[PDB]
Amino acid sequence: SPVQYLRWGDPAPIAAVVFACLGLLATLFVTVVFIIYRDTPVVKSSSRELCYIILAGICLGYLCTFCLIAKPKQIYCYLQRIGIGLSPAMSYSALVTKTYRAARILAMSKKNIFEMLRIDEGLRLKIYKDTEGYYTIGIGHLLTKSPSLNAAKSELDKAIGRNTNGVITKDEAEKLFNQDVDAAVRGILRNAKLKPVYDSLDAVRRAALINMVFQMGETGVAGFTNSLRMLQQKRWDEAAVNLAKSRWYNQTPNRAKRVITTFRTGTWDAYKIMSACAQLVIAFILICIQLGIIVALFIMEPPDIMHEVYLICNTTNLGVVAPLGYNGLLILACTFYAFKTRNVPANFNEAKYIAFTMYTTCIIWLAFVPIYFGSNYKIITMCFSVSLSATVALGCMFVPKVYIILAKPERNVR
Ligand SMILES: COc1cc(/N=N/c2ccccn2)ccc1NC(=O)c1ccccc1Cl
Ligand SMILES: CCCCCCCC/C=C\CCCCCCCC(=O)O
Ligand SMILES: CCCCCCCC/C=C\CCCCCCCC(=O)O
Ligand SMILES: CCCCCCCC/C=C\CCCCCCCC(=O)O
Ligand SMILES: CCCCCCCC/C=C\CCCCCCCC(=O)O
Ligand SMILES: CCCCCCCC/C=C\CCCCCCCC(=O)O
């Protein structure tokens, strides 16, 4: 009984139970909120089905306390090794499926910009020089400012990952082009005249503004003071009429006509250019792998009470480390794709919170490796570790969304 330990001078069991109960309450509250407001754009724009999996893992993580702090029965040794190993696998397999799709969506997003500027600006598959005289390759990608051709080939090989001999491919020029876009977007957000327009435009019209920046530079695009303000006010037809009188349109009319048309329609018509049930199946597969790991250790090392509110079992290091390693790979893969997509603004900046969640999860799980093994109170540390990790996933990811649902119903709009 945790209450009796509290009376005897040990508040740790009663604390871990309160942590778990409050956590189940919150997880129940967040779940019902998402069910009720499932049709709203803050819940329907994401994977509602994967969130239920993520919430189940959080809930199940809080339930582990009731198998770590329980009465001595053999099934609770089975439920310990299930919950502690599977509850993270449930939350992070669905999360890695979610983040990986955002990375594929982000990569396919950058391909359109590349096909756009490939047609407008051009592309060389072997090393050349710009009008300054510095070595270049692809769509105007700078390699080195050194007069040595071998230096250009050296920095090119490091940039691609193979011995290119000064010759690349279309996909390897797309890779280098993605660096030049991020650079140009950084200058835009550092430019006070261009920043408010870029924030207002959709993804297609941001490509057209990046196109212009790639042609005239930041200071040059800043000259279109009136036309920029019309685009910010979403006055497309007027912005094209004004841009069609520019000196930019009369010097390069073929290119400018395509960029201007894209500003009007917000489509790619002027140029030549991941399922949902699959996410459930993939998330289900990644969870069965962890279940297989657990079941195999049930056979190699059957659960058994070692021998008291602390239920101590016979779980050996391999029974702890093997699911811990797989869970760590899920966390690392999550952190990788979440970091890669950390600036994706879709879904009310859903990706900004997911990235911050995985940063904390890494520090928590890495910190509790020396903490746990160097501890003589492993059951208590295991209780708080799971609950803490579960609270971070529930706090950083779902609380910002339940907030907008209940506190800001006016911002809940597509
Ligand atoms: C923070 O540590 C854990 C958290 C766990 N669930 N978190 C959850 C559960 C659900 C949702 C989100 N998050 C499970 C095992 C954990 N730890 C271990 O199994 C472990 C054992 C030995 C050494 C180190 C470690 Cl890190
Ligand atoms: C906003 C809602 C409040 C959220 C926190 C709620 C706090 C309630 C905490 C649990 C009660 C105190 C801890 C239980 C120990 C009781 C001791 C005993 O009964 O012998
Ligand atoms: C009652 C046992 C402990 C559970 C208490 C917490 C309740 C919430 C549990 C997990 C939520 C996961 C998803 C639940 C079903 C989603 C419904 C749906 O698919 O629309
Ligand atoms: C308001 C949030 C919840 C308030 C605290 C609820 C917890 C009450 C404390 C007593 C334990 C209740 C059941 C836990 C059983 C522990 C298993 C065991 O006794 O070995
Ligand atoms: C998305 C999956 C959600 C599952 C939540 C509940 C987890 C239950 C999973 C199966 C437990 C079966 C464990 C094996 C039982 C003993 C068999 C044996 O090893 O001899
Ligand atoms: C950033 C996420 C962290 C990834 C999971 C955390 C660590 C997973 C890696 C393997 C841990 C090494 C286990 C070594 C066990 C030591 C045996 C002992 O001390 O008794």
Residue numbers in the entry: 568 to 678, 1002 to 1161, 679 to 680, 688 to 721, 728 to 834
The authors write:
Metabotropic glutamate receptor 5 (mGlu5) is implicated in various neurodegenerative disorders, making it an attractive drug target. Metabotropic glutamate receptors (mGlus), which belong to class C GPCRs, are mainly expressed in the brain and are involved in synaptic plasticity and neuronal excitability (Niswender & Conn, 2010). Within the TMD, a cavity formed by transmembrane helices (TMs) 2, 3, 5, 6, and 7 serves as a binding site for synthetic compounds that act as allosteric modulators (Doré et al., 2014). Among them, alloswitch‐1 acts as an mGlu5‐specific NAM that can be photoswitched through the introduction of an azobenzene moiety, which isomerizes upon light illumination (Pittolo et al., 2014).
In its ground state, alloswitch‐1 adopts a trans‐form, which is shown to fit into the narrow binding pocket of the protein through a co‐crystal structure of mGlu5 and alloswitch‐1 (Nasrallah et al., 2021). We next performed freeze‐trapping experiments at the X10SA (PXII) beamline at the Swiss Light Source. Here, frozen crystals were mounted on a goniometer, where a laser was pre‐aligned at the center of the cryoloop. Measurement of a crystal without laser exposure provided a reference dataset at 2.3 Å resolution. We used the reference dark dataset for the calculation of q‐weighted F o(light) − F o(dark) difference maps and the extrapolation of structure factors for the active state using Xtrapol8 (De Zitter et al., 2022).
